[PDB]
Structure 1
Amino acid sequence: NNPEYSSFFGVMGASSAMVFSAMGAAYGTAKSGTGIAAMSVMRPELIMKSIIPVVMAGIIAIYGLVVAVLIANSLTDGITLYRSFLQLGAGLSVGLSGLAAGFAIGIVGDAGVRGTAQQPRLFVGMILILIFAEVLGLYGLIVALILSTK
């Protein structure tokens, strides 16, 4: 006696998990990329030490993919309303966490890589701040998997 409309929420959980994490990663890549492009004209040797934020946005994206794929695997044609809402919760948690964490990663990377261009000592501060940002996506992942697996 499982409503057929209930399964929609699980699909939406998977979608959200993918899409919002994707938007966060996209912005994070974007701002860090413009920063890198600006920096590279003056200090090309910093390209590889400065791409790291893009990798971290990529990690936000992989977090989104992991949660979304897990939700998809858990989905079923007669999925219960309770479990489906759990999957929606996981999807929103991870997706919006990734959105926020990516916003942070992008802004931090932009400002930082620019900062290093004029002052190389800042590199350590960059990497610290960037990981502190990525930790938000980690928390999103944590909560998302807990809900998706309950």
Structure 2
Amino acid sequence: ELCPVYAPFFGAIGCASAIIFTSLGAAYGTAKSGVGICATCVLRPDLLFKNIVPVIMAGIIAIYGLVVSVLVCYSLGQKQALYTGFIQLGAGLSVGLSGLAAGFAIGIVGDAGVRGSSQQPRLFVGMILILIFAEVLGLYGLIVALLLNSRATQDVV
């Protein structure tokens, strides 16, 4: 009753979700801001390794999703509690569906920042600072899911 049979469904779908929606947000952040790099580094090919910052900050989101999908996974198990499955589903969603937003906000800022920082060199620091404010959203989702996953098997009978 307290640890039913359908209990690892929520944990497995949370472990899936924490990398699915995270990789979808990171893929938007990679593609949308790679369009800008492939459009502006035709004129300015010297700025390839300088404008690569939004793609890396999109990949750090996917690293945040990977490090929660590998911590929900080793806390899974047959005849685990339904509470543990609900906590793992919540920690899956908190990383995934907020890293989705952070990846949107990294891609659609970083493309305009790469379009702008080829014209004005002083706009690059502003691009990095806005991308830090866009990547701290996925960091906040990481913090919420780590504090949540810490209570998944804490004194659970």
Equivalent position of 2:121 in the other structure: 120
Tell me the amino acid that sits aligned with residue 120 of structure 1.
P
Equivalent position of 2:71 in the other structure: 70
Determine the C-alpha separation between the residues in 2 that align with 1:48 and 1:68.
Answer: 30
Question: How far did 1:149 drift?
Answer: 1.5
Determine the C-alpha separation between the residues in 1 that align with 2:63 and 2:138.
Answer: 10
Determine the C-alpha separation between the residues in 2 that align with 1:7 and 1:36.
Answer: 43
Tell me the amino acid that sits aligned with residue 14 of structure 2.
G
What CA deviation, in whole Å up to 9, does each residue of 1:2-61 have, x standing for no partner?
211111000011011010000000000001100000011111111111001100011000
Matched, 1:4 2:5: yes
Equivalent position of 2:154 in the other structure: none
Determine the C-alpha separation between the residues in 2 that align with 1:54 and 1:4.
Answer: 42
Structure 1 moving runs of 4+ over 6 Å: none
Task: Report the identity percentage.
Answer: 71
Question: How far did 1:121 drift?
Answer: 1.1
Determine the C-alpha separation between the residues in 2 that align with 1:98 and 1:56.
Answer: 11
Give matches, 1:90-129, under 5 Å: 90-129=91-130
Tell me the amino acid that sits aligned with residue 66 of structure 2.
L
Higher normalized helix content (fraction of residues): 1
Determine the C-alpha separation between the residues in 1 that align with 2:19 and 2:74.
Answer: 14
Residue 79 of structure 2 aligns to a residue whose secondary structure is coil
Tell me the amino acid that sits aligned with residue 116 of structure 2.
G
Tell me the amino acid that sits aligned with residue 131 of structure 2.
L
What CA deviation, in whole Å up to 9, does each residue of 1:65-92 have, x standing for no partner?
0011100011011110011100000000
Matched, 1:147 2:148: yes
Tell me how many residue pairs correspond in the alignment. Answer: 150
Matched, 1:131 2:132: yes
Question: How far did 1:119 drift?
Answer: 1.1
Question: How far did 1:111 drift?
Answer: 0.4
Equivalent position of 2:49 in the other structure: 48
Cα RMSD after superposing both structures: 0.7
Determine the C-alpha separation between the residues in 2 that align with 1:93 and 1:45.
Answer: 39
Tell me the amino acid that sits aligned with residue 67 of structure 1.
V
Determine the C-alpha separation between the residues in 1 that align with 2:150 and 2:79.
Answer: 17
Q: What is the TM-score with the length of structure 1 in the denominator?
A: 0.98
Tell me the amino acid that sits aligned with residue 19 of structure 2.
M
